[PDB]
Design a protein around this nucleic acid. Structure first.
Lengths: 812, 90
DNA sequence: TTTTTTTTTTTTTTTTTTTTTTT
DNA sequence: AAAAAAAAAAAAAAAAAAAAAAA
């Protein structure tokens, strides 16, 4: 009779506890009192049995339930309150109790052995509830036996490869409790191989940070899920804090910063900006020099996109930053980069107060730059001085030169700097930029650059003639002259007739260097010849067979530069340089483009050729069908599957072309059927090849779907109004149905016929085209032996066509 | 021309990989039963509760490929002269 | 007797941020 | 006053119905 009373009491407690969370302490108290009375009278087995019986009633409940979510928390609180008593008793002094450790151990053992009787139940809700109970009790369990531990590990390692993702999440929540500095090897296997994103997120969040597991955690920064890519920046690195500058490797850190500040999603970029501008800045003492020192500033190019973000979140720090006269003649890389970023951010906006109260004058900046120039090239490491000079030149290139004295001073400084022969390439480039910024018109910078080049050449010639005692310069002199002339020609936008100095430098330097034996001199000469052909049309017409021969016969860099030059010539001028008296025909250039497209040994050349051909097709130049067919085939080719840049370029260049103008969509539809024909042959040979990667090529149904997506008149960006009448997708379907009589296999026929009921059928469409499509579908349905799904699809298509034709017939 | 370029950059932002990714009340604790535990605690029988072996490992590790950023700005400029911008989409 | 794939279609759950609630 | 539970919205993608072979 006492068992009935125990059951009634525990059932009343459970009924009162499932209501709301308010009052979950008196319930624990009365449960403890009932258990104490039961173990004192001598009836604990009945108490355990009835507890298990009443707990079992919450297993069939669905995850989206609160009644079942209260009972698990009640049981967890009961276990925690029952173990905390023993914890406190063992903590403070050594108080002998009335034998409770054994009772607790037996209770946990029997409760674990009872709940594990449904770990392999067919109902997913029961398994979910069992795993959730185990996860919520694993926090408070104490010491257990070896048999129970082995059984638990076996059950978890069996349920980690479960069908339901939620059961797998509960399994990883259970497994993240048995880690130590077998569970780690299981967790790192789910972070890289689990098909569910929530399981990977849970395994990433609930994994210890150690030198052996940190790479696997940081690798999830390029996950296919946006939440997984955001949690690595808004949770992991935030919890690490200052340890990111000590444990994470420099290159991994720079790669993470690049991936964060250059993501295609707004949430990831916002999270990276929040982490950089707020958490990492507040982790220090509010200073910025230490933050710039943590980053590499030098030997990198990410801080330009980082500090700017810091200038968009906290503008107040932008006001406590100065450059007094004392902090001069002793700059580092951080201070120079800071000055550059400050000046650029103040000039890009309208912050004029700082512009007139912080930055010095031009006459002083010229002297400050000349000081470092003299320390470097006339008297602190070399790399630091070069970086400081580069930053100062970048800051001075966009400087306000209203005064004449400062302008003349900076001009003299840049002449004395560019007149050297030890200067590096970036310094030469930024000096050319500053020189262009220090000129009145275009008739002055060109003259100054030509004068500098001629002075260098004449100095070399005079030195050679003087040393001849005790008519062609050396190779290094030609290299420096061509390097200095490339950046000068890159800033000229005027006819070549108005500039006779460039016309002289052509046959004095560029033209003799074009036919040079050395490869680098030849490459620089080809680059200069291209930069000059993009200025005059006669020189561009007369210089094309040499570029064709350079592409056909030449090294990798030579073909690279020559293809770039040809693409730029066609983009600037057009069809004028071809088809005419004394001009290069278009067939030879088309053959060269074909040969460079089919060549797999040079992937970068393929990428450049594809990009240039897409650029030409996007304009009025190059209106051919075979070239477009070859482009689409190279996009859909199993050989070109290794080149990621080519695929990424085509995937962006084809849709914009097809959706820009209806003529482009018509050109695509006129050849998509033959493309599908040539594509269905390569799949058969790939599937029947015994030598391989059979999954490299896309399946024919996906190709047909993508081709139907490109020939849809509803995806046009103009939408004039007559787009509902134009019949572009019908001709493609008719051509596909005509080619259908040439396919050999039956699975290809099936996957082609199944993906037909997806075209645009309206009433404003034509009548004869719909009719012809009807007779074609009828012939295919009759004079053929199809299956069942293809037959049903064809019948549905014929019914739709008949309905549309009967509707159009009732008119006029 | 700027509006069309912005539209093409905004719409084609998530489809940069190509290939196959081209697509745009109250429980009564007093009532006792007998078939409840039999229906809850039982064998799996025929219904499988595990995932296939082929769907357990993947070589791609569910990672994103290297991004090259093919936008309208990159295709508008030239090659050897990034300052000039040819006329397209017009 | 499940299960399995393909096409076509329509929600569902999560996470962050606020209000109440219980001492 | 501090910690926990409940509720509304945005963000972002997994989930499901139908039909014909397959073990």
């Amino acid at each position: 009779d006492i068992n009935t009373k125990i059951f009634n009491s525990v059932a009343e407690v459970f009924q009162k506890a499932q209501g709301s969370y308010a009052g979950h302490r008196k319930h624990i108290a009365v449960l403890k009192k009932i258990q104490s009375k039961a173990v004192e009278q001598g009836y604990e087995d009945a108490f355990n049995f009835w507890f298990d019986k009443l707990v079992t009633k919450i297993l069939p409940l669905k995850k989206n339930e609160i009644i079942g979510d209260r009972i698990v928390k009640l049981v967890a609180a009961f276990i925690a309150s029952l173990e905390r008593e023993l914890i406190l008793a063992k903590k403070q002094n050594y108080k002998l109790t009335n034998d409770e450790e054994g009772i607790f151990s037996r209770f946990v053992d029997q409760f674990i052995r009872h709940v594990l009787r449904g770990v392999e139940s067919p109902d997913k809700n029961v398994r979910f509830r069992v795993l959730q109970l185990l996860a919520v009790i694993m926090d408070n369990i104490g010491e257990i036996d070896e048999s129970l531990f082995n059984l638990l590990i076996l059950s978890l390692n069996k349920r980690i490869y479960d069908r339901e993702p939620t059961v797998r999440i509960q399994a990883v929540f259970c497994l993240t409790k048995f880690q130590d500095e077998e569970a780690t090897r299981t967790l790192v296997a789910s972070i890289q191989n689990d098909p569910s994103a929530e399981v990977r997120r849970a395994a990433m969040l609930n994994l210890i940070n150690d030198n052996n597991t940190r790479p696997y955690i940081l690798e999830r920064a390029r996950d296919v899920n946006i939440v997984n890519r955001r949690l690595v920046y808004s949770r992991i690195l935030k919890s690490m804090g200052r340890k990111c500058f000590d444990d994470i490797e420099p290159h991994i850190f720079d790669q993470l910063i690049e991936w964060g500040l250059e993501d295609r999603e707004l949430s990831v970029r916002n999270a990276c900006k929040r982490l950089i501008a707020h958490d990492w800045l507040n982790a220090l003492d509010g200073d910025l020099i230490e933050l710039l020192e943590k980053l590499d500033v030098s030997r990198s190019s990410v801080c330009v996109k980082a500090i700017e973000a810091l200038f968009q979140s906290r503008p107040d720090i932008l006001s406590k930053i100065k450059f007094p006269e004392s902090i001069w003649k002793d700059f580092t890389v951080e201070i120079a980069f800071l000055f550059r970023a400050i000046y650029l951010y103040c000039l890009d906006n309208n912050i004029t107060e700082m512009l007139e109260e912080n930055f010095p004058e031009a006459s002083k900046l010229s002297e400050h730059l000349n000081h470092y120039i003299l320390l470097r090239y006339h008297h602190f490491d070399y790399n630091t001085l070069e970086f400081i000079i580069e930053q100062l030149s970048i800051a001075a290139e966009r400087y306000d030169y209203s005064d004449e004295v400062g302008r003349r001073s900076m001009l003299t400084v840049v002449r004395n700097m560019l007149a050297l022969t030890t200067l590096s390439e970036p310094l030469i480039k930024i000096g050319i930029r500053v020189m262009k910024s220090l000129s009145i018109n275009e008739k002055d910078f060109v003259t100054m650059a030509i004068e500098i080049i001629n002075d260098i050449r004449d100095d070399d010639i005079e030195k050679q003639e003087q040393e001849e005692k005790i008519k062609e310069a050396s190779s290094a002199t030609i290299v420096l002259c061509l390097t200095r002339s490339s950046y000068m020609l890159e800033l000229v936008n005027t006819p070549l007739t108005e500039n006779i100095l460039i016309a002289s430098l052509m046959d004095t330097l560029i033209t003799p260097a074009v036919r040079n034996t050395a490869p680098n001199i030849r490459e620089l000469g080809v680059k200069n010849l291209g930069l000059c052909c993009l200025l005059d049309v006669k020189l561009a017409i007369d210089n094309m067979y040499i570029l064709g021969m350079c592409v056909s016969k030449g090294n990798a860099s030579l073909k690279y530069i020559a293809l770039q030059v040809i693409v730029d010539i066609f983009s600037v001028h057009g069809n004028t340089v071809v088809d005419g008296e004394g001009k290069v025909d278009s067939i030879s250039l088309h053959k060269i483009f074909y040969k460079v497209l089919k060549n797999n040994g040079l992937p970068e050349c393929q990428v450049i050729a594809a990009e240039g051909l897409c650029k030409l097709f996007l304009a009025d130049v190059f209106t051919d069908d075979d070239l477009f067919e070859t482009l689409v085939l190279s996009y859909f080719s199993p050989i070109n599957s290794s080149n990621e840049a080519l695929v990424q370029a085509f995937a962006f260049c084809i849709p914009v072309y097809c959706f820009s103008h209806p003529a482009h969509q018509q050109r695509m539809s006129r050849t998509a059927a033959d493309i599908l024909l040539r594509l269905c042959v390569l799949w058969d040979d790939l599937q029947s090849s015994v030598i391989v990667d059979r999954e490299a090529m896309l399946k024919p149904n996906i190709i047909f779907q993508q081709l139907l997506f490109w020939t849809d008149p509803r995806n046009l960006v103009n939408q004039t109004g007559s787009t509902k009448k134009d019949t572009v997708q019908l001709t493609f379907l008719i051509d596909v149905l005509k080619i259908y009589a040439q396919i050999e296999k039956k699975e290809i026929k099936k996957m082609i016929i199944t993906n037909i009921n997806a075209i645009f059928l309206s009433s404003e469409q034509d009548y004869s085209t719909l009719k012809e499509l009807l007779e074609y579908s009828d012939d295919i349905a009759e004079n053929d032996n199809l299956d069942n799904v293809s037959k049903n699809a064809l019948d549905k298509l014929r019914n739709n066509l008949n309905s549309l034709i009967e509707e159009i017939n009732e008119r006029s | 021309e700027k509006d069309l370029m912005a539209y093409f950059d905004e719409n084609l932002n998530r489809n940069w990989r190509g290939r196959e990714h081209w697509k745009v009340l109250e429980i009564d604790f007093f009532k006792t039963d007998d078939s409840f535990e039999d229906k809850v605690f039982a064998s799996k029988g025929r219904t499988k509760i595990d995932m296939p072996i082929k769907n357990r490992k993947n070589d791609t590790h569910y990672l994103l490929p290297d991004d090259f950023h093919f936008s309208t700005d990159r295709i508008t400029r030239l090659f050897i002269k990034p300052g000039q911008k040819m006329s397209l989409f017009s």
